[PDB]
């Protein structure tokens, strides 16, 4: 029945939730949502078993009705508490509910006819979703014949001064990469969202989802919506924009910050299976942290982030490292074969020139690629541009919407003949220097021989490659632990501090770069044959990154001797 539910059960349910400690309610939560305009509420799905043993097993079967008996109970229990006296219910207001659980996730490949008009739980991934048009509830579907001398046959004028308005967003879902796409490609699905959950999910994230598989019109169509979404914890599966982090988390964080044995701890963090290569690694982690995007009263929106390089003989674990940098806030990865054009296609509906837009998708994330080498030049010029001004322009048809995106970039490579070029002269790149110039890092890889190193890289790998070893003994090391922390920690540290230099750093850095350029020019003159602003404006970013690390705003050049001794590697690499 419609009323025996609202008559007592839902209406007293919220009223009855009782554990001493005088918290265990959804009443106070409802009011402290109400006060601040939120208009929502969350529940589990296995608390009702703590109230009864039937209603839940009715919630699954006829959800669409129960989830409005809830709304009626919600407002009729909440407007009593709106009343300070009968004189401050200015007017009532509508709410939306959320429910959650921890039961079990599913996969798209089992969404079939039996799992229809029924609650579920899944786990997928996102690509993109629509804009925000509209939808409403009532105003003053079939609109029948009668009129209300004659007035004939359906003369109905909508009075939209007297209509209403809620939201509408149409979310999307693709599967995960480990549920038999092997002999296939991945399918996907489109969705639906209602009132307060637009701008709750940007594309490119891992989801938990609570939804329902229902139709619109025997070949008729699918779709799904949210029935109280939540999110993922792949380490920190969804910790990408919002904050349910608590003072405990800030406390643990900043207590880690002042701990002055964190950076040399973090130079051993990425590889619980690889040996060595530490000076290569001291600034693969700073690349995430980023420096400062300082605009000024003139134009100079100077380059914020940093950029990476590496090229070397195979056999030194390039691929795993870059896959790991993808793994550990948000990022994507391709390598070669992909663009120079952007996406001016045309929805066959309405025949216009829309802009679908994927350096877009790293506007706070980053990007990593291998093979700038083995992808030719028809698609390098748009990326020549993007990574120096970030004002990604468009001028194709009658649109000049030079949008922008702030992304960094990481580059692997492969040179011909190994260190054949790297011993002799000008075959470092085969193509051009202005994407070798326009970067920051300059880190070459070699695989030189020595018997001690040989035997050690022998047994070091065996204990790694023996029987999925690292259950016990990885975290028992000092502090080389928990990428999940690194995700949430970065998404703090980048989004708070506004650091910049001291006085004493400036003169020392100027003199040092002066000596660097002078040494380059002397190599020009000491060989009778043949230094940007970019090098200064990049190495400053490592000071930026370090001060980002320890959370000190102002940093020193003695703090940055490490950074300039990292750049020393670049200098003595391109020594010739």
């Amino acid at each position: 029945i419609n009323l025996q539910a609202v008559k007592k059960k839902y209406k007293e349910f919220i009223r009855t939730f009782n554990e001493e400690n005088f918290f265990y309610k959804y009443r106070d939560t409802l009011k402290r949502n109400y006060l601040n305009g939120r208009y929502f509420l969350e529940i589990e799905m296995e608390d009702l078993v703590g109230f009864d043993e039937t209603l839940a097993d009715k919630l699954n079967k006829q959800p669409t009705e129960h989830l409005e008996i809830f709304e009626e109970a919600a407002r009729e229990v909440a407007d009593e508490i709106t009343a300070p006296r009968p004189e401050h219910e200015e007017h009532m207001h509508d709410i939306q509910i959320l429910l959650s659980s921890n039961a079990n996730p599913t996969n798209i490949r089992q969404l079939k006819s039996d799992c229809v008009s029924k609650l579920v739980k899944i786990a997928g991934i996102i690509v993109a979703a629509s804009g925000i048009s509209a939808k409403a509830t009532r105003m003053s579907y079939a609109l029948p014949r009668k009129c209300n001398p004659k007035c004939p046959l359906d003369p109905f004028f909508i009075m939209p001064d007297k209509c209403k308005c809620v939201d509408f967003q149409t979310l999307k879902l693709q599967e995960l990469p480990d549920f038999v796409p092997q002999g296939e490609i991945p399918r996907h699905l489109q969705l639906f969202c209602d009132r307060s959950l637009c701008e709750r999910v940007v594309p490119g994230n891992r989801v938990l989802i609570q939804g329902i598989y229902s139709i619109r019109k025997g070949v008729r169509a699918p779709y799904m919506r949210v029935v109280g979404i939540t999110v993922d914890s792949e380490g920190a599966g969804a910790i990408s924009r919002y904050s349910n982090i608590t003072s405990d988390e800030e406390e643990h964080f900043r207590r880690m910050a002042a701990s002055g044995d964190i950076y040399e701890r973090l130079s051993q963090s990425l590889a619980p299976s690889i040996f060595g290569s530490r000076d290569i690694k001291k600034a693969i982690t700073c690349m995430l942290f980023g420096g400062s995007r300082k605009r000024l009263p003139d134009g100079l929106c100077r380059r914020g982030d940093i950029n990476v390089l590496l090229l070397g003989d195979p056999g030194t674990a390039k691929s795993q490292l870059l896959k790991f940098v993808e793994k550990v806030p948000i990022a994507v990865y391709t390598s070669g074969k992909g663009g120079l054009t952007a996406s001016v296609m045309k929805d066959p509906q309405t025949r216009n020139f829309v802009m679908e837009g994927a350096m877009v998708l790293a506007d706070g994330g980053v990007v990593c690629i291998d093979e700038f080498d083995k992808m030719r030049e028809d698609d390098r010029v748009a990326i020549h541009e993007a990574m120096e001004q970030q004002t990604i322009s468009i001028a194709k048809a009658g649109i000049t919407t030079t949008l922008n995106s702030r992304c960094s970039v990481l580059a692997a490579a492969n040179s011909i003949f190994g260190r054949w070029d790297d011993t002799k002269g000008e075959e470092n790149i085969d193509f051009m220097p202005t994407i070798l110039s326009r970067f920051d890092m300059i880190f070459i890889v070699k695989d030189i021989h020595d018997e001690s190193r040989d035997i050690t890289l022998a047994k070091h790998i065996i204990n790694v490659h023996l029987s999925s070893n690292k259950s016990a003994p990885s975290e028992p090391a000092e502090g080389e632990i928990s990428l999940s922390t690194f995700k949430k920690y970065i998404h703090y540290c980048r989004t708070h501090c506004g650091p910049r230099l001291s006085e004493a750093a400036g003169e020392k850095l100027k003199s040092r770069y002066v000596l660097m350029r002078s040494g380059a020019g002397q190599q020009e003159k000491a060989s009778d044959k043949r230094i940007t602003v970019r090098q200064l404006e990049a190495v400053i970013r490592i000071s930026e990154s370090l001060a980002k690390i320890r959370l000190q705003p102002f940093a020193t050049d003695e703090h940055v001797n490490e950074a300039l001794r990292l750049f020393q590697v670049s200098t003595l690499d391109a020594a010739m």
Partner: protein, 171 residues
């Protein structure tokens, strides 16, 4: 202002219980206490029923304003109470907590009372904000206590006035 400071005020209030003993190794403490003999009521303050009930010595029963019916009609009196309502002992928000904490091993109806007392609590509290949405012109000679209680008013005390004086000085 604290959760317990006003229990060094409020917990001194009186109830009436039945112990299970004869007179103790000492019979009576020189003071308003009455004599100790099992099987009959005795009137006490509240810094012992805590100490007594969990010392597994006796029973305990409440005053009369703890019921359902009186605290089901006081609310509908309160609904039209444009100012204030009935006040059973004026610090009754704390005796309830210190009773319903331990006592419910034997007390009757130990939840629905919580329901109604919060149902009065919230309505009067939200009342005690709407004084502020009409309090104009620095009217620091005109305000409300008439049948107010104390355990609510510390929930405002350090917020408004401490700044209100040095702010609304201008009028």
């Amino acid at each position: 202002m604290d959760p317990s400071i006003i229990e060094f005020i409020g917990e001194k209030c009186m109830i009436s219980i039945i112990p299970n003993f004869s007179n103790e190794p000492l019979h009576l403490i020189y003071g308003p206490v009455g004599p100790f003999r099992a099987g009959f009521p005795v009137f006490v303050p509240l810094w012992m029923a805590t100490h007594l009930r969990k010392q597994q010595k006796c029973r305990i029963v409440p005053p009369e304003w703890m019921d359902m019916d009186i605290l089901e009609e006081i609310k509908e009196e309160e609904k039209r109470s444009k100012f204030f309502t009935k006040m059973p002992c004026e610090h009754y928000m704390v005796v309830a907590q210190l009773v319903m904490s331990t006592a419910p091993d034997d007390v009757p109806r130990c939840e629905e009372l919580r329901t109604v007392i919060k149902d009065i609590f919230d309505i009067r509290e939200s009342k005690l904000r709407t004084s502020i949405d009409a309090f104009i012109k620095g009217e620091g000679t005109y305000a409300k206590l008439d049948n107010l209680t104390l355990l609510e008013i510390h929930s405002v005390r350090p917020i408004l006035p401490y700044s209100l004086d040095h702010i609304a000085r201008y009028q």
